[PDB]
């Protein structure tokens, strides 16, 4: 899985 660009470090 991959997070939305720029949200990859959201908790």
């Amino acid at each position: 899985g991959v997070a939305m660009p720029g949200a990859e470090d959201d908790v």
Epitope: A3, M4, P5, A7, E8, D9, D10
Partner: antibody, heavy 119, light 108 residues
Framework: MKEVQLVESGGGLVQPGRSLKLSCAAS????????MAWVRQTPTKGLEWIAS????????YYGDSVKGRFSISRDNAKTTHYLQMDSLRSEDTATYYC??????????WGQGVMVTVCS | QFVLTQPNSVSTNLGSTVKLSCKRS????????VNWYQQHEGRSPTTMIY?????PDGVPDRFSGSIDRSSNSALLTINNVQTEDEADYFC????????FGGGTKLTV
């Protein structure tokens, strides 16, 4: 139990080629636990994503429109993030919204601030 | 980078069921999460659906999202439409960049 609130400041009128800095003050959550973003809107062109900056502030992303002209940053000890806008163009006229991310989407949005670039 | 295509305008009668469509141009609609935002005239967008089909608290049950892979599209369904639902609706997804559909203006 806290209501999340994002508050843009800055913007207004500006000449082309010149610069403007937008601010977003964020409240209601642990600021450095979440990415922040800027999305702009016009009545005919809809929403366009402009820039994003990761939670720790070490990674920035930009839409095609603004690559190399806009720079996004954040001051975590101030719960605020910024959009520095250089080399402004007439077609940058838009309502600019700040937004918070929650992994896979934008969960809360600002009020929107109007930026008017003169011909 | 793909595009998300929504009809410009949709009309329905009150109490009916309306299906707002969001077609992805290249690649699979099911590859990345689809989210839907509502924007009333003069207001900020607010989340109606996140992660394809989850309702934020305070969003009424009659809003529901889904993914129709056969037409490579996402669907925002509104059951028993009220006049308060008249707004602009944007779908949203991503891959390497962030993509918004053009928005569907709902009238009733």
């Amino acid at each position: 139990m806290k209501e999340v609130q994002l508050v843009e400041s800055g913007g207004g009128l500006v000449q082309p080629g010149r610069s403007l800095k937008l601010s977003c003050a964020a409240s209601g959550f642990t600021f450095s636990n979440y990415g922040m973003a800027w999305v702009r809107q016009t009545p005919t062109k809809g929403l366009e994503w402009i820039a994003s900056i990761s939670a720790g502030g070490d990674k920035t992303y930009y839409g095609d429109s603004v690559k190399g002209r806009f720079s996004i940053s954040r001051d975590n000890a101030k719960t605020t993030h910024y959009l520095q806008m250089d080399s402004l163009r007439s077609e940058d006229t838009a309502t600019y919204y700040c937004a918070k991310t929650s992994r896979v989407y934008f969960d809360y949005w600002g009020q929107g601030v109007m930026v008017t670039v003169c011909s | 980078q793909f595009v998300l295509t929504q009809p410009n305008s949709v009309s329905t009668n009150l109490g009916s069921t309306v299906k707002l469509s969001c077609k992805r141009s290249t690649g699979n609609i099911g590859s990345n999460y689809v989210n839907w935002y509502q924007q009333h005239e003069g207001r900020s967008p607010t989340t109606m659906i996140y992660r394809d089909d989850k309702r934020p608290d305070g969003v009424p049950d009659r809003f529901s999202g889904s993914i129709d892979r056969s037409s490579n599209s996402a669907l925002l369904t509104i059951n028993n439409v009220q006049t308060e639902d008249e707004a602009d609706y944007f779908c949203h997804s991503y891959s390497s960049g962030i993509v918004f559909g053009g928005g569907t203006k709902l009238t009733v």
